[model samples]
Target: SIIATVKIGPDEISAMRAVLDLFGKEFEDIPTYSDRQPTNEYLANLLHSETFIALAAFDRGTAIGGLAAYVLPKFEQARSEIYIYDLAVASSHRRLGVATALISHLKRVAVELGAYVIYVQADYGDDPAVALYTKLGVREDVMHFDIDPRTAT
Candidate 1:
């Protein structure tokens, strides 16, 4: 069975380190942004932030995956929506059910907060991840676009 738990205090920093390290090692052949990794101090601050939520996935007390999410209140819609900022499953546990469990827990938390929706951006070319989210019933109707901060300045 997949075990899900909310992270507290220094635990988020530790979990983030483990998650990012695993991500880097897993895709050694691909180039990824170095700045994408969260620092220990950043995670520490997030832990104290009221709008943030972090969940860790474990198997028999060993952390194998984690996700960081945030609650954004939308006054125009008169409801809230949860956004998943980062999600990573240890390379050893990828095909297992750890990620699914983490997402399920996030959904439960969102519902408890009276959120109107939960959303995440999945890369179109990431077949495995796209399949996993599709299996979990996430919609493909949304499109994501980004403008680099470097370009703005």
Candidate 2:
């Protein structure tokens, strides 16, 4: 099968749910879809932004799996970096280069925008994600802290 990866835009805004549904499936959680208009509005806005990117792996226009990422502008430097916020492939689609294809699509976007780096975080026990990321990119051993500044308030 010829896999085509395309950057989603406002015109394809409605496809976000179907694409992200793979995320819910891979993680065994319910997708946040109780609201429609707000989701659509937000998707339209983000998809219109050149910095936010979403890629859908399609099987003849049906979403099989996908990824979402954002290009973040750095205050420390003039250039930006790409952060992969989410990635997942349908169970049936795994081990078929679907994840790599999606990442490669975003890497091209990063080059076009002149972004210097692309990075993503993986949880400690998720071997599949860890292996996939390790296979494709450099590993930075770092600590992650989810800080809520509200605690000091």
Each candidate's root-mean-square deviation in Å?
3.4, 2.1
Which predicted model would earn the best lDDT?
A: 2
Once model 2 is optimally superposed onto the true structure by TM-score, how far is the C-alpha of residue 96 displaced, in angstroms? 0.8
Give the best candidate by TM-score.
2
What are the runs in model 2 whose C-alpha is more than 4 Å off? 31-37
Residue pairs with backbone overlap in model 2: none
Report every candidate's CA lDDT: 0.71, 0.81
Please give the lDDT score for candidate 1: 0.71
- For model 2, residues 22-128, the per-residue Cα lDDT tens digits are 67767777545322235677778888897888888887667776888988999988999999988988888778888888888888989989999999999999999
lDDT of 2 at 76: 88
